[PDB]
Symmetry: C3
Subunit: 116 residues, 3 copies
């Protein structure tokens, strides 16, 4: 899976090791092995969420097969909100998630595409 | 709506408050309430636009229903170019926009997905 | 084409001029003119790739017509991996690419959309 987190929290207000802990949480929540989990954290950005520049975060989650229905994404959302609200000290109104299904022909890995 | 702006202008050459003013402009242009507008500004990046590393900006706009046709996006583009060229002091050849339709099952909000 | 590169290498470990050289390489690999090539490099991020926080990079490539099949993307992947592994001094296991087809109605250029 690919997780991208944008936040207006400065880097020194993002807890050390968040990218590693988010990697472990995402493996458990999405049901994918941790060695296939990718996390990108981009802190110190200028952001408005729901019209407000108060501290906030945006998460994007892309994966094959497991983020393509409302029922699957409702379950994932509950767990990712629980993890991020407590790690970043943010209220549930200061985070939004976007889910993007991917297919195997879109992923370049070790110099090829493995669309088995 | 979700707006993401990447620029190679350093943070101290991006006008203070741009994220707030872009939030208000996007509400008016896209016809969505300001409390549903999200803006992310990522300055100080290394960028080439149209093969040139001169100052530039890339905007991505994602929304339900209103960015899915050429006719709708032509109208939005005129207004967003007018706003960004004047705020960032950039020529119209130094900005590009990408439009991405979203559906309600892709948005995680307050720990769930509200696909009514 | 639009290329976005995220890396946890600090800016001072990314070779000067990478965005310009990636622009020239992408024109040759994708078969598009260099004056239509866009590159965004975002260094100094916190990242885990395949569960590891060792140096890594993520590349996203978006274009009309030429990134929409496994056969086309397999060819592109070989060349982009060769270029990035050697420029960034990274092993082939520390880079991943995602490919995204675009259509002409999604691109705002000079204040309009040119969907001919
Ligand atoms: O099993 C596959 O078809 C395959 C091929 C290339 C990449 C991946 C893959 C998929 C996911 C995902 O579904 O979230 N995440 C990471 C990878 C990867 O192996 O790097 C899966
Ligand atoms: O009304 C909906 O179905 C719904 C459900 C969850 C989120 C949103 C929403 C939509 C947009 C958009 O169309 O640009 N932007 C923001 C939101 C949101 O409420 O946060 C809309
Ligand atoms: O020829 C087109 O239809 C057209 C219209 C507007 C933009 C572009 C374009 C396409 C690509 C791509 O296919 O990778 N990249 C850049 C552009 C652009 O001209 O800026 C192409």
């Amino acid at each position: 899976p690919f997780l991208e987190l944008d936040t207006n929290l400065p880097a020194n207000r993002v807890p050390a090791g968040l990218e590693k802990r988010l990697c472990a949480a995402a493996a458990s929540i999405l049901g994918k092995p941790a060695d296939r989990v990718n996390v990108t954290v981009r802190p110190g950005l200028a952001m408005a969420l729901s019209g407000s520049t108060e501290p906030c975060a945006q998460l994007s989650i892309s994966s094959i097969g497991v983020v393509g229905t409302a029922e699957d994404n409702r379950s994932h959302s509950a767990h990712f909100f629980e993890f991020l609200t407590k790690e970043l000290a943010l209220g549930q109104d200061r985070i939004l998630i976007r889910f993007f299904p991917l297919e195997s022909w879109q992923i370049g890995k070790i110099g090829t595409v493995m669309a088995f």
